[PDB]
């Protein structure tokens, strides 16, 4: 635009929160569908829904992780990563049912002299593979759900050989996208790439996706966020560079049904 | 209104170019694929395109019966340490690999299911003897109905369960079933658990398998030889073929790249090297 | 109740048609019509918020 | 499949000039490549793949 | 009676 | 608008002639055949001609199923030095001679192919025993799909390849296939190679058979007995009949005059004397 | 969707007709109609550039 | 008669010198170093069909008392709109003495035969570097 | 443009070839005349011309040369530099007569920390001076026509003193533009400058120029391309920097007359 | 419905 508007410079405002960026690579709307509230013709639970609106549909920043030459990748699940985030988390644990869309904003700046590229993927039903070759489908609820800290990918599959006290955790191998399919094909999922010379962030607007209009947020994650180094971090001639990666995520058009007493999960 | 059997777009003739229009240059970071066609980067002639994508419509891609299981039954005398063998199979497409991999190009699906049954029998013992033509009963028992415990017990009465009585040597049996899911679509992947572990509850009590939803998702097929036994032993097998008709699919996925290892997405050590050696600058 | 549709004829020896009658009350019993629609790949190939013009800079 | 009669030819990449960097900059880097079909692309004669099997 | 497609 | 079953032209009456018109004289050097009819060289009467060329239309000339192969399978116990026999056949019309010679009156053709399968079985050993009715699986595996290595391996699942499960003693099996060529017509003759030998390459590396195009032109049919084995051995044969329906042909050729010798036009020494002795002035 | 055509009757005991309905979507599944055309042999019998008049000298 | 479809690219493609027919089939008995060439027998049109029937192909006859040339205008013919000219020949030109040369009472007459050919409406696709074939 | 179109970012497509640039300084059309085929009113040979079109009017890349602190300059002649380029070269050697225009694209990238400036000149009838003060107009055909390797300029005139076996080559002195006129005035010829801080390429569209409608391409060069360092290469504090220069040239609207057997020149 | 030839 001759008034200066740019593909690269954006402002997102949800609730009492605003994100600015000056080095964006446009932004993605997954499957071309913007988030929406549940329509009457698709509705299923009959009780009046709660719609917390600005109290929950706002940007929550998770703990910042660190990208280094040895990093194999990171993953998070939604809504799990937001289970402890203000009134969104509260609404989630107080209700049997809940649905939500999200704006995901991944942040990672560096310099004109650094290089590297992060693949940022939003995967519907991101089922990951377990650490076991003695029992399949054995990852425990506690290990499947890290909350905001997320998990990581590994370059090596290593089977849990403790049969007495199994680890019961995932063992997500990076080139196999943590799920037995090739990473080079993850681009069929809604994605952006943070290539440090080009941009310093990724923005993905995710609709609620499921085979149901609404479901148990506590039992089921709708989306997975997978961040993998497609091209490794590098800087000048330093052997041990580091740059931070920050995740900020906002729920959108979230509504809840089936109010009762609060859920108190076994998370450890 | 564009149909699957319509011809694809014609190539339009294009000549030399020298401008500020830059189709070839792009930025994959955006998450988009550059929509180019040959006339954007080379000189083209006019071609009237007749080819179509008719055979790769979702319906056409799936319009085939695939074997999902082999059930074994026999017609032997039940004796104190061993009974006449009837078969019980939990309905699924995950016991075999080929249809499973095709459905798993997608996250969710809706379809009407066509099941076709191929039935073959043979003698197992040496003796001369004979058997007369067998009739088979394929009974569907849905989650909650009494599963048969003996080849001849009351459950084979089927007052409400659907059964097929198939006569050996006649055309393979076939039935259709509608979209029977308890959700708006079948989930090929469920990133969740069927139970929330509560703190106030024992770990055992809150536990459940990762990625599993209803323990008896679709029920069972129970198959038996209806005939009484012969002096001679005859073993039979029922091969089940599944075809998804009237199908819709959502959310594409990368296909399975390493061997299947159970009903989930798990993989086995030693099978994780799909790709083969090939040098970067070797054609 | 007969449905008459046209065949797309490949090798040749007017429009040739074929006939179909549904014999059952349940639509699940029907054969597949194979009369399917196509859609544009955009939701997967161009899921970006701002419409892409291919001759223009993707980043401006 | 690999077939001489229906062979497609050769894709290759070359340096036209060279990669140039200033001081204080990495002298080596990666490029990534992607492939996709154009709107005139089609397939036919459905078949099983060799890319999955089930031994025993 | 008849439908034509 | 002249159809194949229309009556041929009437003979028109013609009387004596004495003129400069010379129909009888001609010059075959031109490459043309003299278009004469009886009234050009003799006196004729008027005849209303009723005969037609209906049976020699290209369609009618080819409207017959011809045997193109015999496949052998068995249903024997697989044992360490020998497995149960399943059959694999490269689809072609050149393993037999009769349909081949008819198609080769022409250089190119287009047709829809009808395949009919006749299946016969017998006991091979002396013993009394029995076998129960066999079911056969005829699987089409197109170039690139996994060819079966064992009668019972994963490829017989057929999620995408078309298979026919045929029941012994029922009507011969039959399917149709469209014109499936990767060219605009089938080439009965290809005067070329599938590879150019380059100078910068070894001779071995540039080599290819004369007249051969795609190494696996149309794929294979793999046939098996689906039943498990009996104590008694049963051998079966599947005879395949091919009929070209909806056919078009181009560029006529002299028919094969000496015995076929391989898939190409090659001939064998000692077979090159089709014609027999007959004296020039002997009727 | 029925196609009604006439038979050419050989031995006799009006026009006698027969009926045909295509049961399948693919034209490849159809029977052969045998309703074929004839053409003149000229492309093979008289492929010469200058039209031949049979009463005239072929060489002039 | 030990290997069918074995004529090498080099022997199948003589370039402008062409090849010749023979009145006799003679099988290559060198199995160590096979000749890998054609052995086209004249009355069998070099291809196992009778020469007397070759007139169903587009032809002319040079009968010396009548004419001193043959002219054939050939369209592009193939089962494809376009193809590899280097891998595939579309047309073959076969010249055979239907009636043998004879002159006065000379025992050893000779007259020359010259071939002049012009390409027509030729077009090419898929430009790259030049093909350098192994022709010997 | 508010859609982003830039003077600096161009794409050129001729035949099966495309050039992209992101740091152009616009492009030049020599004398404001775009290349054209020969008009009937200006035609001279009467035989049907051949016009190979895409087979010859496409981008051919010549051998890459190297720019250093000691470089005095480079030169090429057209059509000579393209005499061995695919079907263009073939058409040239098979015909007595030929005419052609050209798109010349000179390529040279470096970095924001390098500096230097190349003058890129297209000269009609670029007659260069010889190495001799014993015989004038003595440069041999072989030395006048280097083909794609081109020649170079020198800062020093040095007369060939071998009278027995004269070198018979050019001795083109840089400040005298290799032809006895001052280099500072070469800007009256169609030109661009590759100044490394500003741009990484030069693009010159050259019409066919001659005192005839068509001529012998084998005997006569219509255009000369002269590339000289107006400001020397420099980088950081390195004493011996190097950056490559690549020439890619495409014939345009070329037509040929007088077909015979192929010319086989004595080039060595 | 019907076609007549
Ligand atoms: C007389 C025989 C009747 C047989 C009736 C079978 C009815 C049950 C059909 C179940 C449908 C199974 C569909 C496939 C599997 C699921 O889609 C996946 N696990 C995803 O949810
Ligand atoms: C379930 C059985 C399906 C069988 C499907 C067979 C499909 C393949 C048909 C191939 C068509 C072969 C036509 C004949 C041969 C070629 O025309 C000649 N070599 C010329 O190219
Ligand atoms: C619409 O169907 C009216 C025309 C009826 C045509 C003949 C029907 C042929 C037999 C139909 C049997 C229906 C099966 C229950
Ligand atoms: C046109 O076909 C309308 C008349 C229908 C006449 C009766 C059809 C008889 C049964 C047809 C079955 C079609 C096979 C899929």
């Amino acid at each position: 635009e001759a008034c200066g508007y740019s593909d690269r410079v954006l402002q997102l405002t949800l609730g009492n929160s605003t994100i600015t960026t000056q080095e964006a690579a446009n932004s993605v709307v997954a499957y071309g569908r913007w988030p929406e509230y549940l329509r009457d013709s698709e509705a299923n639970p009959v009780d009046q829904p709660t719609e917390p609106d600005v109290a929950a549909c706002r940007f929550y920043t998770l703990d910042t992780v660190s990208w280094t030459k040895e990093s194999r990748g990171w993953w998070w699940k939604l809504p799990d990563a937001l289970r402890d985030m203000g009134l969104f988390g509260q609404n989630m644990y107080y209700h049997y049912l809940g649905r939500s869309g999200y704006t995901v904003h991944v942040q990672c700046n560096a310099s004109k002299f650094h290089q590297g590229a992060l693949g940022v993927f939003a995967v519907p039903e991101m089922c990951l593979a377990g650490d076991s070759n003695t029992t399949t489908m054995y990852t425990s609820y506690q290990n499947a759900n890290p909350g905001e800290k997320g998990g990581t990918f590994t370059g090596t599959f290593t089977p849990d050989n403790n049969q007495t006290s199994p680890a019961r955790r995932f063992c997500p191998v990076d080139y196999l996208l943590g799920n037995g399919t090739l990473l080079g094909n993850a681009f069929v999922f809604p994605h952006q790439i943070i290539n440090l010379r080009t941009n310093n962030c990724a923005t993905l607007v995710l609709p609620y996706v499921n085979s149901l209009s609404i479901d148990s947020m506590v039992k089921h994650n709708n989306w997975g966020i997978a961040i993998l180094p497609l091209a490794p971090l590098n800087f000048a001639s330093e052997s041990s560079p580091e740059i931070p990666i920050t995740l900020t995520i906002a729920p959108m058009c979230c509504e809840f049904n089936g109010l009762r007493n609060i859920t108190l999960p076994r998370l450890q | 209104a564009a149909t699957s059997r319509d011809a694809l777009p014609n190539t339009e003739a294009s000549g030399p170019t020298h401008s500020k229009e830059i189709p070839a240059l792009t930025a994959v970071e955006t998450g988009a694929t550059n929509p180019l066609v040959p006339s954007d980067t080379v000189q083209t002639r006019h071609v009237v395109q007749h080819r179509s994508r008719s055979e790769s419509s979702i319906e056409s891609f799936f319009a085939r019966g695939a074997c999902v299981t082999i059930m074994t039954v026999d017609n032997s005398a039940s004796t104190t340490n061993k009974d006449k063998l009837f078969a019980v199979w939990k309905i699924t497409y995950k016991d075999t690999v080929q249809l499973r991999r095709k459905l798993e190009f997608f996250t969710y699906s809706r379809f009407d299911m066509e099941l076709t049954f191929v039935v073959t029998a043979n003698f197992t013992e040496t003796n001369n003897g004979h058997a007369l033509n067998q009739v088979y009963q394929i009974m569907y028992v849905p989650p909650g109905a009494p599963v048969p415990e003996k080849w001849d017990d009351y459950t084979w009465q089927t007052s409400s369960n659907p059964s097929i009585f198939y006569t050996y040597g006649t055309a393979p049996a076939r039935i259709s079933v509608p979209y029977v899911g308890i959700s708006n679509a079948y989930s090929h992947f469920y990133d969740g658990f069927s139970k929330v572990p509560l703190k106030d509850q024992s770990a055992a009590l809150g536990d459940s398998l990762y990625g599993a939803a209803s323990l008896n998702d679709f029920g069972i097929l129970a198959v038996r030889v209806v005939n009484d036994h012969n002096p001679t032993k005859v073993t039979s097998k029922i091969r089940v073929y599944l075809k998804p008709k009237h199908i819709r699919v959502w959310c594409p996925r990368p296909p399975r790249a390493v061997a299947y290892y159970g009903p989930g997405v798990d993989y086995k050590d030693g099978t994780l090297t799909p790709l083969s050696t090939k040098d970067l600058t070797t054609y | 109740g007969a449905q008459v549709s046209s065949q797309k004829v490949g090798a040749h020896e007017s429009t040739i048609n074929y006939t179909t009658i549904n014999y059952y009350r349940d639509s699940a019993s029907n054969a597949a019509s194979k009369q399917d629609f196509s859609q544009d790949p955009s939701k997967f190939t161009e899921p970006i918020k701002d419409v892409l013009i291919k001759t223009a800079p993707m980043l401006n | 499949i690999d077939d001489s009669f229906t062979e497609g030819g050769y894709i290759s990449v070359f340096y036209q000039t060279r990669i140039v960097v200033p001081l204080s900059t990495p002298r080596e880097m990666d490029i990534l490549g992607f492939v996709s079909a154009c709107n005139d692309f089609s397939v036919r004669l459905l078949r099983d793949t060799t890319h999955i099997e089930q031994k025993a | 009676g008849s439908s034509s497609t």
Side-chain angles (χ1 to χ4, degrees), chain A, chain B, chain C, chain D, chain E:
Chain A
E1 163 67 305
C3 217
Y5 299 113
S6 177
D7 203 41
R8 306 177 167 252
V9 190
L10 314 173
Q11 182 180 317
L12 323 181
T13 297
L14 280 154
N16 62 1
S17 66
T18 289
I19 290 174
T20 61
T21 180
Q22 296 196 66
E23 295 186 63
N26 205 320
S27 61
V28 166
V29 181
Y31 303 126
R33 286 275 295 275
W34 199 272
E36 75 188 15
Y37 285 99
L38 181 53
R39 291 164 237 166
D40 301 345
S41 56
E42 294 180 338
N44 184 222
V46 300
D47 62 318
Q48 241 306 135
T50 321
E51 312 184 351
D53 182 55
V54 286
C57 301
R58 60 179 311 284
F59 287 114
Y60 299 101
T61 299
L62 329 196
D63 289 325
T64 298
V65 302
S66 180
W67 180 14
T68 75
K69 296 243 236 286
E70 352 311 315
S71 296
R72 308 307 295 215
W74 308 262
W75 57 266
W76 292 265
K77 301 304 185 75
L78 294 170
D80 182 56
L82 302 184
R83 69 193 192 198
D84 297 299
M85 296 293 199
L87 284 169
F88 175 78
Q90 291 303 303
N91 270 286
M92 177 176 143
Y93 284 119
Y94 265 104
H95 294 89
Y96 162 39
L97 303 167
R99 52 180 265 148
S100 188
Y102 306 92
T103 292
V104 179
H105 192 65
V106 183
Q107 297 136 91
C108 186
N109 52 282
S111 80
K112 282 160 161 52
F113 295 82
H114 292 62
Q115 66 193 30
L118 301 169
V120 181
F121 308 92
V123 184
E125 307 297 345
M126 190 168 89
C127 296
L128 301 177
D131 62 3
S132 180
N133 284 174
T134 78
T135 310
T136 57
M137 296 181 290
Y138 203 34
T139 302
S140 74
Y141 181 93
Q142 298 69 24
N143 296 318
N145 291 292
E148 88 174 285
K149 60 171 178 297
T152 52
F153 287 88
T154 178
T156 293
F157 179 62
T158 154
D160 179 26
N161 283 136
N162 194 329
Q163 282 204 238
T164 267
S165 339
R168 286 188 76 192
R169 46 182 83 162
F170 291 132
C171 187
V173 181
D174 53 13
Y175 67 96
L176 295 179
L177 190 54
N179 65 6
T181 70
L182 286 175
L183 180 108
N185 295 326
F187 300 89
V188 302
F189 296 122
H191 63 276
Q192 283 206 312
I193 299 172
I194 299 176
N195 184 18
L196 297 176
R197 64 177 272 126
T198 308
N199 57 319
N200 65 27
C201 61
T203 304
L204 285 63
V205 179
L206 316 180
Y208 180 75
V209 173
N210 197 351
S211 64
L212 291 168
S213 293
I214 201 172
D215 200 352
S216 175
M217 294 190 138
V218 177
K219 290 176 180 186
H220 176 209
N221 287 301
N222 312 293
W223 286 98
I225 299 302
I227 299 175
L228 294 98
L230 304 176
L233 181 63
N234 239 300
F235 173 55
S237 271
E238 318 321 273
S239 53
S240 308
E242 175 289 317
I243 49 178
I245 299 171
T246 297
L247 251 75
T248 300
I249 303 174
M252 293 172 91
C253 303
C254 63
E255 68 185 84
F256 306 86
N257 289 80
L259 179 71
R260 353 124 294 209
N261 53 307
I262 195 170
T263 298
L264 301 169
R266 173 191 293 276
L267 294 178
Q268 280 95 232
Chain B
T3 75
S4 57
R5 71 179 184 193
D6 292 342
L8 301 175
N10 289 340
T11 302
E12 298 303 328
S14 66
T17 173
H18 184 126
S19 77
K20 305 180 209 78
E21 301 190 342
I22 50 156
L25 290 177
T26 194
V28 310
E29 296 88 341
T30 63
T33 299
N34 198 0
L36 304 192
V37 293
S39 51
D40 293 313
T41 55
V42 300
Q43 288 190 224
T44 55
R45 64 169 282 161
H46 180 233
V47 179
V48 179
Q49 181 52 260
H50 306 300
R51 287 184 285 104
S52 94
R53 288 172 176 190
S54 56
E55 218 176 332
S56 54
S57 67
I58 300 308
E59 194 76 17
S60 287
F61 182 68
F62 288 102
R64 293 293 118 104
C67 188
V68 290
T69 197
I70 305 183
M71 302 179 70
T72 302
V73 296
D74 77 26
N75 187 13
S76 297
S78 295
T79 63
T80 57
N81 78 275
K82 166 89 163 54
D83 304 302
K84 178 176 166 173
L85 178 67
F86 67 96
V88 167
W89 170 64
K90 218 183 138 288
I91 301 163
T92 183
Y93 57 76
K94 295 186 182 176
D95 288 346
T96 55
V97 301
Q98 288 183 162
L99 169 62
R100 184 182 178 173
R101 196 178 188 252
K102 291 175 73 187
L103 288 169
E104 282 177 20
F105 270 89
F106 308 98
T107 311
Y108 309 110
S109 62
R110 272 178 81 95
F111 54 83
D112 288 336
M113 201 215 278
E114 186 192 77
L115 294 178
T116 311
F117 306 85
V118 178
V119 184
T120 51
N122 59 286
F123 297 106
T124 50
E125 6 195 63
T126 221
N127 194 338
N128 152 302
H130 227 286
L132 295 174
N133 203 62
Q134 292 167 309
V135 176
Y136 303 75
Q137 182 178 357
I138 306 170
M139 176 167 76
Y140 174 30
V141 354
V147 181
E149 278 166 9
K150 302 298 183 176
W151 86 278
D152 59 356
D153 69 27
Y154 76 93
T155 67
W156 300 99
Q157 284 176 33
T158 28
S159 56
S160 319
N161 303 344
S163 294
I164 302 162
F165 288 89
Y166 171 77
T167 294
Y168 194 76
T170 61
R174 178 181 273 177
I175 54 94
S176 297
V177 136
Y179 169 65
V180 296
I182 59 175
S183 289
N184 301 87
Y186 291 132
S187 297
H188 303 172
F189 300 84
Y190 173 65
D191 185 21
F193 297 79
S194 70
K195 305 191 188 251
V196 191
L198 298 164
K199 298 165 66 63
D200 186 306
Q201 165 208 62
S202 71
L205 248 18
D207 208 359
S208 61
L209 294 181
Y210 175 69
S214 15
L215 279 185
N216 201 353
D217 218 346
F218 307 109
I220 63 141
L221 293 185
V223 180
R224 70 167 174 163
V225 173
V226 183
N227 309 59
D228 296 333
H229 76 98
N230 277 298
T232 310
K233 292 177 178 166
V234 173
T235 296
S236 316
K237 276 165 181 185
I238 296 79
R239 280 179 178 75
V240 183
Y241 298 84
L242 194 174
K243 180 174 66 167
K245 323 147 158 185
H246 317 136
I247 185 172
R248 293 179 64 195
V249 295
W250 300 258
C251 307
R253 300 180 82 86
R256 189 68 181 181
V258 298
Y260 283 116
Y261 181 66
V265 304
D266 303 306
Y267 38 62
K268 196 182 168 170
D269 197 20
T271 68
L272 314 183
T273 63
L275 290 117
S276 56
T277 311
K278 186 61 170 184
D279 170 74
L280 191 57
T281 52
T282 289
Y283 289 106
Chain C
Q3 156 70 339
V4 182
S5 316
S6 63
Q7 305 180 323
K8 176 183 176 176
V9 183
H12 309 262
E13 185 174 338
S14 85
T15 184
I16 316 176
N17 305 312
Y18 67 106
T19 306
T20 314
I21 291 166
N22 285 150
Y23 307 125
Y24 299 93
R25 187 163 169 87
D26 315 278
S27 50
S29 293
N30 308 342
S33 82
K34 308 297 181 61
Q35 295 165 45
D36 299 304
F37 289 99
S38 277
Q39 74 185 11
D40 146 58
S42 292
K43 57 171 71 155
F44 312 116
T45 57
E46 293 166 67
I48 51 175
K49 186 159 179 291
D50 296 327
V51 149
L52 111 68
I53 301 122
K54 75 179 175 182
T55 49
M58 179 107 100
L59 297 167
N60 188 211
Chain D
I1 62 187
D2 283 343
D3 174 47
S4 282
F5 188 65
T6 55
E7 60 185 347
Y10 309 106
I11 271 73
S12 62
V13 183
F14 295 81
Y15 287 98
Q16 180 66 340
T17 51
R18 75 174 172 78
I19 297 293
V20 189
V21 293
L23 305 181
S24 303
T25 313
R27 297 178 66 201
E28 309 189 328
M29 55 269 127
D30 299 310
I31 58 174
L32 307 177
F34 297 83
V35 66
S36 47
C38 303
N39 67 172
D40 67 346
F41 195 95
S42 65
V43 296
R44 61 175 197 199
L45 219 172
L46 181 71
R47 69 173 176 76
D48 279 292
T49 184
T50 61
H51 291 221
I52 192 81
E53 50 202 278
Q54 174 169 15
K55 285 301 151 68
Chain E
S2 303
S3 285
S4 207
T5 4

